[PDB]
Ligand binder design. Structure first.
Ligand SMILES: Cc1cc2c(cc1S(=O)(=O)N1CCN(C)CC1)S(=O)(=O)N[C@@H](C1CCCC1)N2
Ligand SMILES: Cc1cc2c(cc1S(=O)(=O)N1CCN(C)CC1)S(=O)(=O)N[C@@H](C1CCCC1)N2
Ligand SMILES: N[C@@H](CCC(=O)O)C(=O)O
Ligand SMILES: N[C@@H](CCC(=O)O)C(=O)O
Lengths: 262, 262
């Protein structure tokens, strides 16, 4: 029927979507800025739809409760019809691909290690072979699921430690994990996606850094409810933006163009 | 109806698909070895189908003739029903996505520069600002289309030069481009995907090397005819293989495990 305003679900995660300094002075979409904000505008223009940016209610990416089988986060908002599309650093995973549609990836990444500068850790193997330095991941995300499901010796060992570590090594938001790294004097290391790791390394106080190679390789995709008529155009738009070098341009804009660590 | 033997189209491109040294002593699939050969076996197992590997008749990846609008290469074999699926280093592109289906990428890459060791070239900009060193790309592939369609100053300049360069700077196969780099005493540079560039750098006589950063970022996907019932299972299989670390394991097996340059 008649075209409707597309409800976009996203998440406050720097530098993808951030509240503008003067957000209280603004309305609707103008309140936000970031890589995914710019991306949303581009996708909307190439697909010919108008939209409304909304921040996921529970502030989560998306995981299924082992008992209720209920999905939370952005994935849940799509599954239960609360949102028409998710434009955020949402990792393409098998369990998610089965319940929602994903465009081809618009950004690539891999799980990585964030340490406070000077921390005597160079790899995941280093972390797994010691206990003085605690380490964890984000909750309700793909990184935690990666360790939970891995049969790779080193990652299995890490998961075995993290799952029963006390106090908890898991955090509710990336900002929390970063804060813990910064305020733990090198006694806490954070496992997060290289993309977020790289961004933080260029932010003051410039006291963190990515160490070692990525643990895996994957990407973020724009998600729509399974079977959504929007999926097709969105996917083609992602490819066009990729081929025009627009995606690369947006990453440089939000990651390095204005890096604060030289 | 009854399950049929799936006809797989692929291409002789090292180290994706190569004729085994003793291929004349073998039959069918046993004749070949390589990253895509192993990948084909994995995909087939997880999707539950048996298959027959076939080498694309014209030895091309796939491009549409501007006049006849006829597709050649592996893309054409899928479009015209000669093959049921393509398992090869086939780049996911917009023009192709429109006529065939692509699974999520199983390997990432970007266009890069291959030089004979010692060549005074460090970047695409370097190449574009000189003429003593010729440079070109593969025919009927995504790299050539990249330069033909780019509006980015440096790449536009490069394309303008390549399209009218004499003698021709374009080659029919990757092996030809590499041979030209090796036998041109540094007077020819080859633009090819980082994946193939990296493989060659680890092959004797160890006289080539990748220089500069990738010009773009994309990936290879397994392709099926548009609407094919195989697409779904194949995509899920790619994700599972990605998550199990199998894809990373296969790349190491064919790229570095037995590198010949230390
Ligand atoms: C710019 C870009 C385009 C792109 C991807 C990543 C990226 S990136 O921003 O993550 N790029 C990665 C490499 N890095 C050196 C620069 C940034 S991707 O591999 O996740 N998806 C691909 C599209 C194009 C065909 C495959 C899907 N494009
Ligand atoms: C192992 C692997 C998995 C994978 C990709 C590339 C690769 S890779 O072999 O190209 N990998 C790239 C990074 N390099 C350091 C190691 C090899 S990808 O980005 O092209 N596609 C992704 C899947 C997983 C979700 C997105 C599609 N997985
Ligand atoms: N991008 C991840 C969240 C970050 C993480 O898990 O490290 C996801 O989609 O779940
Ligand atoms: N992978 C490319 C071929 C190699 C190249 O163009 O450099 C394609 O699918 O066309």
């Amino acid at each position: 029927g008649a075209n409707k305003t597309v409800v976009v679900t996203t998440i406050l995660e720097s530098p993808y979507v951030m509240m503008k300094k003067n957000h209280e002075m603004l309305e609707g979409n103008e309140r936000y800025e970031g890589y995914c904000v710019d991306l949303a505008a581009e996708i909307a223009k190439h697909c010919g739809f108008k939209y409304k940016l909304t921040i996921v209610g529970d502030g989560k990416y998306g995981a299924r409760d082992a008992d209720t089988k209920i999905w939370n986060g952005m994935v849940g908002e799509l599954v239960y019809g609360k949102a028409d599309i998710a434009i955020a650093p949402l990792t393409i995973t098998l369990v998610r691909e089965e319940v929602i549609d994903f465009s081809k990836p618009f950004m690539s990444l891999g799980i990585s290690i964030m340490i406070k500068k000077g921390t005597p850790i160079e790899s995941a193997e280093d972390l797994s072979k010691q206990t003085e330095i605690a380490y964890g991941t984000l909750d309700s995300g793909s990184t935690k699921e990666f360790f939970r499901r891995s049969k790779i010796a080193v990652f299995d060992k890490m998961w075995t430690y993290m799952r029963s570590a006390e106090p908890s090594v898991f955090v509710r938001t990336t900002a929390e994990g970063v804060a813990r790294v910064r305020k733990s004097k090198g006694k806490y290391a954070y496992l997060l996606e290289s993309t977020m790791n790289e961004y933080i390394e260029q932010r003051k106080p410039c006291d963190t850094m990515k160490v070692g190679g990525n643990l895996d390789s994957k990407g973020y995709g724009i998600a729509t409810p399974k079977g959504s008529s929007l999926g097709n155009a969105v996917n083609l738009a992602v490819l066009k933006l990729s081929e025009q070098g627009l995606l690369d341009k947006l990453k440089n804009k939000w990651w390095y163009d204005k890096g604060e660590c030289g």
